[PDB]
Design a protein around this ligand. Structure first.
Ligand SMILES: [Mg+2]
Ligand SMILES: [Mg+2]
Ligand SMILES: [Mg+2]
Ligand SMILES: [Mg+2]
Ligand SMILES: [Mg+2]
Ligand SMILES: [Mg+2]
Ligand SMILES: [Mg+2]
Ligand SMILES: [Mg+2]
Ligand SMILES: [Mg+2]
Ligand SMILES: [Mg+2]
Ligand SMILES: [Mg+2]
Ligand SMILES: [Mg+2]
Ligand SMILES: [Mg+2]
Ligand SMILES: [Mg+2]
Ligand SMILES: [Mg+2]
Ligand SMILES: [Mg+2]
Ligand SMILES: [Mg+2]
Ligand SMILES: [Mg+2]
Ligand SMILES: [Mg+2]
Ligand SMILES: [Mg+2]
Ligand SMILES: [Mg+2]
Ligand SMILES: [Mg+2]
Ligand SMILES: [Mg+2]
Ligand SMILES: [Mg+2]
Ligand SMILES: [Mg+2]
Lengths: 211, 147, 52, 95, 204
RNA sequence: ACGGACCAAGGAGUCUAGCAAAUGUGCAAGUGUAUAUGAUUCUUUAAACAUUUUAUACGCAUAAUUAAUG
RNA sequence: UUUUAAUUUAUUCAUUGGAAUUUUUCAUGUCGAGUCGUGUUCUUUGAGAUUGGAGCACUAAUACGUGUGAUACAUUUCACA
RNA sequence: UGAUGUUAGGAGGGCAAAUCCGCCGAAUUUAAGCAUAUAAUUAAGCGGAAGAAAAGAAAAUAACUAUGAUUCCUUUAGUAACGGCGAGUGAACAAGGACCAGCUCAAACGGUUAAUCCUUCGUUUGGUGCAAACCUUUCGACGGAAUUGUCGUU
């Protein structure tokens, strides 16, 4: 090496030519994929090809304020809407047997999502022109007039999408409500200076309870 | 483009620009970072002083999501508001804004700059620095801690 | 020997593509420029040339 | 750090019990088989040795028993559990 | 039931009764051929835990394997290479002895059949003894049974030479998960291949 | 001192990765629509067009310094 | 020609066996062994008082148990499986 | 219980390899020399499959207001770490997408009655063929396997 440059670093010391991959068909493939998932719809004959997923928070202090879709409702969320895991699968509803509900807010949020979904669909009888009640929490079948007059409306695929945040980032207050005698830095530092012994006292409490 | 390459200018000359006496041989000083500390020492020393040796403690499994923390100075604190909304808080003296910087992606409020005199403001955040918190208290505001 | 991993294409800034399209439509409305591209429009009435 | 299941969190980012303030939400066949197997099988040799050392009945004997069980099984833990089990057996035999 | 008592008894192996029984078994296994058939499982309870069923197409065989390490294959023990590669006399194989026992009966002697599992029945200073379960994929008793007829499809031919039995799963690194086995799936070579790859856009 | 009996055709600083300096272009405290998806895109088109009906994907920049708790 | 979506009629009668949830009653059973693990020797990994595998010696517990939480120990709390 | 049987009915063997699965296993080269290191868990050698193969329904992460079988694309990142700490080497979690699926045995329970399975020979229906041929469909008998454990429940 001879000049004022950065010191070299490249990882090209094995037989690197055997495995190189140039992408010539990234748009051909998306055309193919679009046509396949469009062919599925014409075979489902009116029912959608999407499935309902819950709303969950993201796990870290880096992301815990925003939400996304999860892979399936819990057992306790399903019973809040009067459904069974086995019955719910036969509708486009997903089941997760290992997520939990550590708070009330998530429980009510997903129960409301389930109830909104269950309230906006018409059931087609198994044998035609033979309407019967439901089972396991499935709504009762529809009559041929409603079925005829709902095949011309546009299906709502917006229900499957994740919720949008609308929390504002500023607000207004009255000056007379301002607290003057507060000290945030001192609080933040006294809280750290005290953690070790509070942990110790909690462990002693745990030992006492165990007997 | 091969049209504008420097080698096309030397097409009639013998040595192609590399000299009669010292030719263009292949690797006449080593390969890669070979000779440093022996005969490339001066280049290393005057362009990259602290290169050799080790210092400090090891951290065996880092997990960078635990200490992510973007910052914002008090300079840029009134600029988050739109100009028309910035305007009415000047005339009226009875009302102050309440700003939540964690809705904008900031975590720790830091204290460089100058706030407008006698123009109160209330700020929410996870962390504050001492100077920033004092400067907010001086113009008649308050700091609020969230999580 | 020629290779398939020669960089065949380019990626262009979106704003520059839009700029070029806009500045190209504007050149379509000047009579002298259309004449200087080789179009035989001596008998035309207006160069923007809208039709029903 | 630690948290308390009762007494909800405080909205501070650091310290004990920190975080956002969401609402928190809360065989006799075995012994019969064991007795039959005990009739059939008996005691392993290292178990016999441990019983002997426990029977001697001093503090040096208990320390040597712990070391021996630890050597045979590995793991301080496993050896400690084995010593406890043999102590219970020998106590029961004396009644 | 009955099987629970056998399972508890076989857990000792150092009681007087089990020691006597194991001595008597291990003597007789020495006089018989290296690979021989038995008529019934000698440990029915341990065989049920693996896939064994009492149906027409299930059989048992017995195998005998030699213990220790294998000397590296250079003539006169002379290596022509660098001192890091001059080792011989303590080279250790990737595969178990159990996998080798399964392959001794699976490759040619019973190419009719398919290998399912095996279990330990004894050991000695020179040999280790196993028993291998085989299923016949052409008998209609297994072929009509909806629970066990995955075995009669050609994608399951010679499971003991591709690493697909339990002993194969052990030495391939697929018995542990997570941060201790991060680079073993879907296979060691395929995981290595994915990481060597250079992917390269058209427009760039 | 070495190569050259003669003539015709062929014959040697290139390609990819990564960094920098110089210069041209666009926007500017921001900038770059990644992988995907959409469209009354579908010889050409493997191109071109679009972006999810007080708006948190990611990179570089907007803040440094310390082995480190910070 | 291939197959797959809508739309067009099922009426009367006759058993037998299954299933989901709800109201109450009584029962806490089972859970993969020469395996897991530890010592030692050689390989392999980014893995560091040892990441996975293998040979030899020793050889467990019973769900309140067992295993993981990236520095070797002892006495403990907690979470996850 | 083993040998025996040109007894009746069946299976394996060889070819081909671009992509896939298991084992075995170098040196050239780089370090401006060279022995650990690198080349490389690569080339050559020996075995085994499919239109894909392998992986796969937690003895998993995290430390949060928590997520949730496998695979692959964008990024994390030439980063945490390894190294004659030299030359050189080098992953994982969270985030955004493609696709989207779950189940069985073993072990509990069933004894006024193994409920289970297979071979061989019979019969009983409707459709499709010019023909060849094929599909669907219950009910018997004799013989054998199995309590050293088939089937049902969960
Ligand atoms: Mg010159
Ligand atoms: Mg020259
Ligand atoms: Mg050699
Ligand atoms: Mg080897
Ligand atoms: Mg000369
Ligand atoms: Mg001459
Ligand atoms: Mg420039
Ligand atoms: Mg970077
Ligand atoms: Mg278990
Ligand atoms: Mg190595
Ligand atoms: Mg962790
Ligand atoms: Mg043959
Ligand atoms: Mg073959
Ligand atoms: Mg050299
Ligand atoms: Mg050299
Ligand atoms: Mg040399
Ligand atoms: Mg090869
Ligand atoms: Mg084949
Ligand atoms: Mg497969
Ligand atoms: Mg598999
Ligand atoms: Mg990745
Ligand atoms: Mg090492
Ligand atoms: Mg390597
Ligand atoms: Mg993901
Ligand atoms: Mg059973």
């Amino acid at each position: 090496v001879a000049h004022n440059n950065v010191l070299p670093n490249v990882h090209l010391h094995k037989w690197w030519q055997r495995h190189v991959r140039v992408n010539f068909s990234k748009n051909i493939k998306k055309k193919k994929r679009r046509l396949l998932r469009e062919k599925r719809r014409k075979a489902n004959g009116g029912t959608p090809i999407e499935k309902l997923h819950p709303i969950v928070h993201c796990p870290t202090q880096r992301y815990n304020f925003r939400t996304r879709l999860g892979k399936g409702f819990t057992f306790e969320e399903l019973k809040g809407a009067g459904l069974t895991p086995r019955a719910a699968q036969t509708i486009g509803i997903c089941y997760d047997k290992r997520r939990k509900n550590r708070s009330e807010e998530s429980l009510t949020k997903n129960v409301e999502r389930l109830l909104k979904y269950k309230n906006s669909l018409v059931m087609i009888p198994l044998k035609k022109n033979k309407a019967k009640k439901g089972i396991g929490g499935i709504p009762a079948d529809a009559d041929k007039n409603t079925i005829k007059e709902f095949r011309n409306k546009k299906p709502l695929l917006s229900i499957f999408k994740k919720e949008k945040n609308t929390k504002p980032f500023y607000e207004t207050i009255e000056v007379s409500k301002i607290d003057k005698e507060f000290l945030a830095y001192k609080t933040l530092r006294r809280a750290k200076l005290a953690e070790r012994r509070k942990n110790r006292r909690q462990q002693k409490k745990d030992i006492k309870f165990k007997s | 483009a091969t049209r504008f390459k420097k080698n096309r200018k030397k097409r009639g000359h013998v040595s192609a620009g590399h000299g009669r006496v010292g030719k263009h041989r292949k690797h006449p000083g080593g390969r890669g970072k070979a000779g440093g500390l022996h005969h490339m020492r001066i280049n290393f020393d005057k362009y990259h002083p602290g290169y050799f040796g080790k210092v400090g403690m090891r951290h065996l499994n880092l997990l960078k999501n635990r200490t992510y923390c973007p910052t914002i100075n008090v300079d840029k604190l009134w600029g988050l508001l739109p100009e028309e909304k910035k305007k009415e808080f000047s005339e009226n003296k009875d009302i102050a804004p309440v700003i939540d910087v964690t809705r904008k992606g900031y975590f720790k409020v830091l204290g460089n700059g100058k706030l407008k005199h006698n123009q109160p403001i209330v700020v929410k955040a996870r962390y504050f620095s001492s100077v920033a918190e004092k400067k907010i208290k001086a113009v008649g505001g308050q700091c609020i801690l969230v999580a | 020997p020629t290779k398939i991993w020669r960089r065949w294409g380019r990626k262009v800034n979106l704003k520059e593509k839009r700029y070029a399209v806009c500045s190209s439509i504007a050149a379509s409305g000047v009579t002298s420029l259309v004449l200087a591209r080789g179009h035989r429009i001596s008998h035309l009435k207006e160069v923007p040339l809208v039709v029903s | 750090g630690r948290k308390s299941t009762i007494k909800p969190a405080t909205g501070i980012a650091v310290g004990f019990n920190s975080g956002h303030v969401v609402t928190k939400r809360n065989s006799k066949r075995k012994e019969l088989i064991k007795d039959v197997v005990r009739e059939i099988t008996g005691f392993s040799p290292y178990e016999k040795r441990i019983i002997e050392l426990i029977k001697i009945g001093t503090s040096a004997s208990t320390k040597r028993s712990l070391k021996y069980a630890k050597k045979k099984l590995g793991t301080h833990k496993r050896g400690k559990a084995k010593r406890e089990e043999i102590q219970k057996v020998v106590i029961l035999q004396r009644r | 039931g009955a099987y629970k008592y056998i399972q508890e008894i076989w857990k000792k192996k150092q009681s007087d009764a089990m020691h006597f029984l194991l001595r008597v078994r291990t003597w007789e296994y020495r006089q018989l051929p290296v690979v021989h058939r038995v008529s019934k499982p000698s440990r029915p309870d341990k065989a049920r835990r693996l896939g064994y069923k009492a149906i027409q197409g299930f059989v048992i065989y017995r195998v005998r394997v030699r213990r220790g390490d294998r000397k590296k294959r250079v003539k006169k023990g002379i290596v022509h290479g660098k001192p890091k590669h001059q080792g011989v006399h303590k080279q250790k194989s990737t595969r178990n002895l159990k996998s080798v026992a399964e392959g001794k009966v699976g490759k040619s002697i019973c190419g009719n059949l398919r290998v399912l599992n095996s279990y330990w029945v004894g050991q000695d200073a020179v040999y280790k003894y196993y028993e291998v379960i085989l299923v016949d994929p052409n008998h209609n008793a297994v072929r009509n049974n909806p629970k066990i007829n995955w075995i009669c499809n050609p994608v399951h031919k010679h499971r003991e030479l591709r690493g697909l039995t339990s002993a194969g799963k052990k030495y391939r690194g697929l018995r542990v998960k997570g941060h201790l086995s991060a680079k073993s799936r879907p296979s060691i070579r395929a995981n290595w291949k994915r990481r060597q790859l250079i992917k390269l856009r058209k427009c760039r």
